[PDB]
């Protein structure tokens, strides 16, 4: 019997174990209305073209329990069989009490019965279409259906085609910070639970007393976290798969107010509340639709924690997003799942690609082709060792920035110098450093000008003190000594291009001469290198 998938966390590192070894989700995620047998023919070709190893796809409460007590797993049966035929794995997305803050995917007998399953009430007494996490009947009903889905996987998915489940989808509330219903006010205007007071090491009191100006938001996050933890515990008691929640992000630099962003989700200001309230939820995953490097880089920093494995549970499917695979994996990320990878005639532009076509898919296939050939080796190095990864750090030049034209000719040479500097990244690899640059020839040392559009990146894993696994894309990687060498010289000892067969390295060729004189130059094609550096005495 195949071992259960498990999220391992050790010495601040994390692995998603699948079939007893670390695994990387090189994902594809459907649009929101592809969770039906007839839609699957519009999902698989994209997944094949992408080279994805894992499909993220919804399972909706409305579809599995359309009449109370009358369960229907017909979709899950077809999805399992067709995934198995393609030798891919699944992440099921439980669309239930919350889907983007709302109950649209709850059955009609739930979402149309507000007295049994109550909505968030604003301070002014107006109601929002967002179920209250203090609704005890709604918690019992969600938990009961979730348990029936997990019983379906316990009985029908013994080899764990499904490796992980997302509990709810982008929880929270737009339009208000919390529930201000009478039922919610009786809990708010009362003692904070001792367990939270103890975990945050705070002094006992009421929500307002203990949290002050943050009481309303922290209250909603705590109550939603508890609700999602209870659904999670109930499901894991049936089959103990990894389970996670996906966050409708607030802007980490300039968030605005809770309710403008989805209040109560796992936003960066309430990760402490979520971790204290929901010990059974494996990780809190960001849904990334910010296109600019600085903001995305900040999200990856905030969500990668000693207590939080990094899973990019959604990302935009426009071209600029593909290169974020590199920093995601460099952070020890367990996966990456671009959203909207199907041909069901929908695009979420402006969040994603304006057009969905083979070119849209190819931007992701090209970076997946760097990782797929080493996926198990990379996953093990990421968990047990030292890895790094970078993306091209300037976004594509805007029409408003092309401003460049109105610049004097000295402002221009200075711009070119400034861009070359910004397109040059340093990595400290112990005894050796790497310098990664973007958008230059494969010969000579003309400064980097960037790729058009921005697209490059690099992955490095340490194999030994002087040996690295390297693959990169539309970039140059150069090695150098990390520390002054006291009389010694240094060189590349050997660069081998090759592959892993049955976990053994197979060399195909040695890079040397022009291929190593000017750093290690990558285009759009996949090359996996083993780089051995040496210092040597000359005296
Ligand atoms: C600044 S910004 O990046 O432009 N802010 C955008 C963040 C708001 C986006 C909400 C995303 N929701 C996700 C969840 C998926 O299920 C599906 O709905 C999907 C959307 O296509
Ligand atoms: Na990892
Ligand atoms: Na060093
Ligand atoms: Na150094
Ligand atoms: Na090769």
Numbering used by the authors: 36 to 437, 439 to 575
Paper text:
GM1-Gangliosidosis and Morquio B disease are two manifestations of mutations on the GLB1 gene that encodes the vital lysosomal β-galactosidase. This enzyme is responsible for removal of a β-galactosyl residue from the non-reducing end of its substrate, converting gangliosides GM1 and GA1 into GM2 and GA2, respectively. Based on X-ray crystallographic studies of compounds 1, 14, 16, 17 as well as 22 and 31 in complex with Cellvibrio japonicus β-galactosidase (CjGH35), a tractable bacterial model which shows around 27% sequence identity with the human enzyme, notably conserved active centers, intensities of inhibition and chaperoning properties, may be partially rationalized. For the inhibitors studied here, the ligand sugar moieties have clear density in all the active sites and overlay with ring C atoms 2 to 5 in similar positions.
Ligand 31 is identical to 17 apart from lacking a hydroxyl group at C-2, the importance of which is reflected in a much poorer Ki value (200-fold worse for human lysosomal β-galactosidase). The active site residues are similarly oriented in all of the structures, with slight differences for 31. There are two other differences in the ligand interactions of 31 (not only from those seen for 17, but also from the other complexes studied here). Firstly, there is a hydrogen bond from the C-3 hydroxyl to ND2 Asn204, in addition to the three hydrogen bonds to Asn67, Lys134 and a water molecule (which is hydrogen bonded to OD1 Asn204 and OE1 Gln64). Secondly, there is a shift in the position of Gln64, with the NE2 atom forming a hydrogen bond to O Ala348, instead of the OE1 interacting with a water which is hydrogen bonded between O Thr65 and ND2 Asn67 (as seen in the other structures). These probably play a far lesser contribution to the weaker Ki values than the absence of three potential hydrogen bonds from a C-2-OH group. The importance of this interaction is clearly seen in comparing the Ki value of the GH35 bovine β-galactosidase with 17 and 31. These inhibitors differ only in the presence of the hydroxyl group at that position, and indeed 31 binds some 20 fold less tightly, corresponding to an approximate 2 kcal/mol difference. An even bigger 200 fold affinity difference is seen for the human lysosomal β-galactosidase (GH35), implying crucial interactions of this particular hydroxyl group with GH35 enzymes. The corresponding deoxy derivative 31 exhibited distinctly reduced chaperoning activity and was only trailed by deoxyfluoro analog 37. For the cyclopentanoid chaperones, on the other hand, OH-2 appears to be a vital feature for their activity as inhibitors and pharmacological chaperones, since its absence and the concomitantly increased basicity of the adjacent amine apparently cannot compensate for the reduced number of interactions with amino acid residues resulting from the removal of this particularly crucial functional group.
